[PDB]
Design a protein around this ligand. Structure first.
Ligand SMILES: *[C@@H]1O[C@H](CO)[C@@H](O[C@@H]2O[C@H](CO)[C@@H](O[C@@H]3O[C@H](CO[C@H]4O[C@H](CO)[C@@H](O)[C@H](O[C@H]5O[C@H](CO)[C@@H](O)[C@H](O)[C@@H]5O[C@H]5O[C@H](CO)[C@@H](O)[C@H](O)[C@@H]5O)[C@@H]4O)[C@@H](O)[C@H](O[C@H]4O[C@H](CO)[C@@H](O)[C@H](O)[C@@H]4O[C@H]4O[C@H](CO)[C@@H](O)[C@H](O)[C@@H]4O)[C@@H]3O)[C@H](O)[C@H]2NC(C)=O)[C@H](O)[C@H]1NC(C)=O
Ligand SMILES: Cc1cc(OCc2nc(C#N)c(N3CCCC3)o2)c(C(C)(C)C)cc1C#N
Ligand SMILES: [Ca+2]
Ligand SMILES: [Ca+2]
Ligand SMILES: [Cl-]
Ligand code: NA
Ligand code: NA
Ligand SMILES: [Zn+2]
Length: 806
């Protein structure tokens, strides 16, 4: 119930929301059907439209009018945005040459530059170029301010997941808005785009910017705007707020546009009908900027222009139907569209089995336009798993396609030509970022970055301490003129041991054999030095990774590679090695095929054993430093040390061998040497965070050798590829992967073909930021470079997407 017999007289768009059942006047009252009777009358004035005209200049104040052209309007803060242009001979902000804003040029009383977040739905990245002719205001913001060629949204590339990620710096799996549509089994409740449940606070995790602000004594304008409050009124309200007395005036504001998303669904991302929506958004921008200029704030305020996601071409005829794969279609609930999520229709059905469903959706048709996945086998880069609201079964749908349950759903629910929600690395899902203001840089292009990083920066722009979030604070310092956040390297928690030769061959009973016993102070002094770390400057280019947790490990030095060996997990946490451009690939010799050698630096008790691999009929093994890339026949003996060995399914060995035998050399050619750090990852609880010992769900049979869930590699070279990796004087270039350690290759539909046809594709699908790998390992890389930490932070957040050009 709401008693709507109160009035909004003087209360229009009140910031402090009043509790039921007294009527509401805030920008959300329409959505809750709870406005005061006079809300339309007082708060949604429209009389005479949105622009001053020559005859309206210096008029008598008429309180009915939407905006004003009277002499007093500037004081009252309620002129039409074009008032000075029409009545005082001022130019539009867009027609003014842009000039560097070296410092905040704010009215007295302003304790800090305000921040206005101008957010646009479905604003695809390529619109900045392709629609630049029709977008003069926006195009002026872009080129005079700071801009990225695109901004990477989060998966799924929908609205609420993205807008709330912007507001929180969190992955949807952490903030809770994991889709446009959701069921929470604990609440036994549902979240939809329409209706009212979505307004319950319990869906919304983390701390959004407005709450971070308020808790820290910084006032906020409200962020959420009902669809029926026209754009012009939203702008006027923000301008009005900006004129409030110092003690009442908000410091952070948001504008929202339903366009271009709305039209792009109807007409597709490039439908000729798309020009108009883009014209109108630009007109809105021009109004804001004109409004700001009038108020002497256009060189004081920091403006962010940001989209939530892009838009792709998607029509009805391009749907896949689960009914063409599944017999049991009515025993399941599918969340449909540009992503699939599947659960049982009823929890009382004990015959339901995810295993058989996945299998029935796997590589069943030739050009199949989606791929099923247990959520924990989704590429780790999507961080889309650690939430009870995300169904165990997920379908990654091909760009340009839809998945529905049955054909009837598609014709009884072509209507649309555009849609979004696909994998976040997909070009058409990319969105925009422009920062313009005193705190942003002047005429600066920055590289593509992820929207999860904005929360931090908006906190910086406001002088706020950010709530704990998924951004890497400092990785976007290069966007900023001042207010940068200067982070320290995390302190190392565990210092390594440096074991010497402390065990005799005969103390090891691991069931390992190696045909190695074929025997000079020239090459005997040389090898000691190698085992003391003589070649370490070559293979450990950026210093050793720091272990950021309490554990017990050893640094092991070799001719061709260096490792941090875990006595707890009985394998390396990392193996580091440099492959120069000229380096040569050799084979594993016949007499060495099944050779495994005891490491006389590491005790039997802290070693793996060959017997456990013999007994484990499913588990085989691989090596972290590839024997194929040994520098000499004599050095190759080190590749076979038990302390270089890791557990590997024969299905995964196919992948690993091809990467180690073929791809590393290829990269070294193409990049002028590469440095490689490889290792295991354990994430059985799929929270994207390093597992403790007691979280491991699988061991090599009969042993305490834990089985990795994933295998990572970090591949570094010189950004200037004319300089070889080991003699790089400037910025670095990185690409990385986190491969799932799976006992089949069901994921790659072409795995029965040669590795050259499918492996590299899989790696690309599982591209990763170094930062992802840090989360998963508790390591901290790049501890000793000549580079600035902020640059190294940006590097660590870099993702190599393998998409073609924007
Ligand atoms: C991305 O960034 C985020 C932000 O940092 C990272 O997530 C954090 O990770 C922390 C480590 O997992 C985690 O810390 C835990 O907090 C528990 C208390 O949490 C409540 O309070 C916080 C603070 O305000 C709040 O943020 C939480 O909100 C979550 O939960 C509610 C649901 O109730 C949601 O509405 C909300 O969206 C959010 O959900 C998400 O996080 C939870 C984890 O809390 C997930 O489970 C959800 O699926 C969802 O994704 C909470 O309101 C605290 O209880 C934990 O302490 C336990 O574990 C430690 C281990 O150190 C142990 O010492 C303690 O004894 C305790 O264990 C006891 O309970 C256990 C289970 O109940 C049991 O096993 C034991 O036997 C004990 O009885 C823990 O400290 C922090 O909450 C989240 N924060 C957020 C916002 O998500 C995330 O890691 C980053 N991702 C990546 C890849 O880097
Ligand atoms: C800029 C910004 C805007 C914003 O909201 C703008 C907004 N209002 C409505 C309404 N009605 C709406 N819907 C999206 C699709 C249906 C309606 O979206 C939000 C939140 C509040 C969504 C979390 C966060 C940020 C951030 N950061
Ligand atoms: Ca949207
Ligand atoms: Ca984990
Ligand atoms: Cl969804
Ligand atoms: Na085996
Ligand atoms: Na396959
Ligand atoms: Zn949309």
């Amino acid at each position: 119930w709401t008693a709507t017999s109160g009035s909004c007289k003087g209360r229009c768009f009140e910031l402090q929301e009043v509790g039921p059942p007294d009527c509401r006047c805030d920008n959300l009252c329409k959505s809750y059907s709870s406005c005061c009777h006079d809300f339309d009358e007082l708060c949604l004035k429209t009389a005479r439209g949105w622009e001053c005209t020559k005859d309206r200049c210096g008029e008598v104040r008429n309180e009915e009018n939407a905006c004003h052209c009277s002499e007093d309007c500037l004081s009252r803060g309620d002129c039409c945005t074009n008032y000075q242009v029409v009545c005082k001979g001022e130019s539009h902000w867009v027609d003014d040459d842009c000039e560097e804003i070296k410092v905040p040029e704010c009215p007295a009383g302003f304790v800090r530059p305000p921040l206005i977040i101008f957010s646009v739905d479905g604003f695809r990245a390529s619109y900045m170029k392709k629609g630049s002719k029709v977008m003069p205001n926006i195009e002026k913001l872009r080129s005079c301010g700071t801009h990225a060629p695109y901004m990477r949204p989060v998966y799924p590339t929908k609205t609420f997941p993205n807008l709330y990620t912007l507001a929180t710096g969190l992955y949807p799996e952490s903030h809770g808005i994991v889709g446009n549509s959701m069921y929470d089994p604990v609440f036994d409740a549902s979240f939809h785009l329409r209706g009212r449940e979505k307004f319950n606070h319990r869906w919304w995790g983390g701390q959004p910017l407005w709450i971070t602000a308020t808790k820290q004594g910084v006032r906020a304008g409200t962020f959420f705007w009902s669809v029926s409050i026209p754009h012009e009124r939203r702008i006027l309200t923000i301008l009005q707020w900006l004129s409030l007395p110092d003690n009442e005036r908000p410091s952070v504001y948001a504008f929202y546009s339903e366009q271009p998303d709305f039209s792009g669904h109807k007409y597709g991302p490039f439908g000729p009908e798309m020009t108009n929506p883009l014209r109108e958004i630009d007109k809105t921008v021009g109004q804001l900027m004109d409004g700001l200029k009038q108020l002497r704030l256009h060189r004081c305020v920091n403006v962010i222009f940001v989209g939530d996601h892009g838009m792709e071409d998607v029509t009805c005829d391009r749907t896949e139907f689960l009914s063409n794969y599944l017999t049991n279609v009515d025993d399941i609930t599918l969340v449909p569209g540009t992503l699939g999520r599947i659960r049982a229709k009823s929890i009382n059905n004990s015959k339901y089995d995810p295993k058989t469903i996945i299998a029935a959706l796997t590589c069943k048709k030739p050009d199949q336009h989606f791929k099923p996945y247990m959520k924990q086998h989704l590429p780790k880069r999507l961080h889309y798993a650690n939430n009870r609201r995300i169904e165990d079964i997920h379908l990654l749908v091909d760009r340009r396609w839809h998945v529905a349950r049955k054909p009837l759903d598609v014709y009884k629910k072509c209507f649309f030509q555009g849609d979004h929600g696909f994998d976040n690395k997909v070009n058409s899902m990319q969105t925009v970022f422009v920062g313009y203001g005193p705190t942003f840089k002047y005429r600066t292009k920055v590289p593509p970055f992820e929207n999860i990083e904005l929360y931090n920066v908006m906190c910086d722009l406001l002088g706020l301490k950010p709530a704990p979030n998924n951004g890497t604070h400092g990785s976007l310092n290069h966007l900023l003129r001042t207010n940068t956040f200067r982070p320290t390297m995390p302190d190392e928690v565990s210092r390594p041991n440096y074991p010497g030769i402390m065990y005799l061959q005969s103390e090891f009973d691991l069931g390992c054999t190696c045909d190695d016993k074929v025997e000079n102070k020239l090459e005997e002094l040389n090898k000691r030095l190698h085992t003391k770390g003589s070649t370490k400057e070559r293979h450990l280019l950026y210093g050793r990774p720091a272990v950021l947790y309490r554990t017990s490990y050893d640094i092991l030095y070799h001719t061709d590679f260096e490792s941090g060996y875990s006595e707890i997990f009985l394998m390396p946490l990392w193996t580091s090695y440099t492959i120069s451009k000229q380096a040569e690939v050799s084979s594993i010799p016949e007499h060495l095929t099944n050779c495994v050698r005891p490491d006389v630096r590491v005790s039997p008790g802290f070693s793996q054993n060959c017997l456990a691999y013999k007994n484990d009929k499913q588990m085989s093994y691989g090596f972290l430093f590839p024997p194929y890339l040994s520098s000499s026949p004599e050095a190759k003996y080190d590749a076979f040390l038990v302390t270089n060995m890791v557990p590997m399914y024969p299905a995964f060995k196919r992948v690993w061998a091809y990467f180690q035998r073929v791809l590393v050399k290829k990269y070294a050619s193409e990049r002028n040497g590469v440095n490689v750090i490889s290792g295991p990852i354990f994430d059985y609880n799929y929270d994207g965070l390093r597992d403790t010992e007691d979280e491991i769900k699988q061991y090599v049979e009969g042993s305490s050798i834990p089985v990795p869930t994933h295998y990572y590699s970090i591949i570094t070279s010189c950004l200037d590829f004319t300089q070889p990796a080991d003699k790089c004087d400037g910025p670095l270039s990185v690409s990385s992967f986190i491969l799932p350690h799976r006992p089949d290759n069901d994921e790659s539909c072409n795995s029965s073909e040669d590795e050259s046809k499918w492996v590299e594709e899989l790696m690309k699908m599982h591209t990763a930021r170094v930062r992802d790998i840090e989360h998963l390992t508790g390591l901290d890389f790049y501890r000793k470079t000549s580079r600035s930490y902020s640059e190294i932070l940006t590097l660590k957040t870099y993702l190599h997407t393998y998409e073609s050009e924007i």
